[PDB]
Design a binder for this molecule. Structure first.
Ligand SMILES: CC(=O)N[C@H]1[C@H]([C@H](O)[C@H](O)CO)O[C@@](OC[C@H]2O[C@@H](O[C@H]3[C@H](O)[C@@H](O)[C@H](O)O[C@@H]3CO)[C@H](O)[C@@H](O)[C@H]2O)(C(=O)O)C[C@@H]1O
Length: 188
């Protein structure tokens, strides 16, 4: 199949600066056009207001990054290129929330633009259920020329590190195609 990254049973905590570095997998991410990023995780119960689940970021460009994040329990998503402009529509007020202190999954899919999807397609699902679809772009890591770092948890944006939290991560899986809603229902 389509699996290009799988990381199991890792965690972010004080001892690792609330971060699991995956930056060695950056070239695999840059190559993707259609993609899925899936995480199954358990946040500590009284979570920070904003915390990153999976991000790609830059040592030189503070505002160029991709993040799947949680904001006041809402599963959210943002990608910004070398001009700092948004790749996707706002997800901060997307309808689906995670339950901290328990197991949850969040799945992001991206489809590059095609004849029938002229601006591409991005979806975020929470616990197998579509939260929001965004048809602004199908931009992804291939569209971020200055990225250097990949991580679960605390995210290095140039000379600052932000969005850390304590997470148990049963798995992070990245695929080289966009799973369908039906696959997200069964494969989560
Ligand atoms: C998904 C999401 O909400 N992303 C926003 C992000 C997060 O809410 C926070 O990081 C969570 O803690 O906040 C961002 O804004 C915070 C930073 O703004 C920077 O200044 C901006 C300024 O506010 C802009 O209006 C201006 O046009 O450009 C400046 C340079 O970036 C500050 O310099 C920085 O210290 C923070 O205050 C973020 O970038 O983190 C915006 C995300 O969209």
């Amino acid at each position: 199949g389509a699996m290009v990254i799988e990381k199991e049973d890792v965690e972010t905590n004080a001892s690792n600066g609330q971060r699991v570095d995956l930056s060695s997998e950056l070239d695999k991410l840059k190559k993707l056009e259609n993609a899925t990023v899936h995480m199954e995780f358990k946040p500590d119960a009284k979570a920070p207001a904003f915390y990153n689940l999976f991000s790609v970021s830059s040592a030189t460009k503070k505002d160029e990054y991709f993040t799947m994040a949680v904001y006041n329990n809402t599963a959210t998503l943002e990608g910004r290129g070398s001009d700092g402009k948004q790749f996707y529509n706002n997800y901060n007020d997307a309808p689906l929330k995670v339950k901290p202190g328990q197991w949850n999954s969040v799945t992001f899919t991206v489809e590059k633009p095609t004849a029938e999807l002229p601006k591409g397609r991005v979806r975020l699902y929470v616990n197998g259920v579509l939260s929001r679809t965004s048809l602004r772009s199908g931009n992804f890591i291939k569209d971020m020329p200055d990225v250097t770092h990949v991580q679960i948890g605390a995210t290095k944006r140039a000379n600052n590190t932000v969005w850390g939290s304590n997470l148990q991560i049963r798995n992070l899986t990245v695929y080289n195609r966009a799973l369908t809603p039906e696959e997200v229902q069964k494969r989560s």
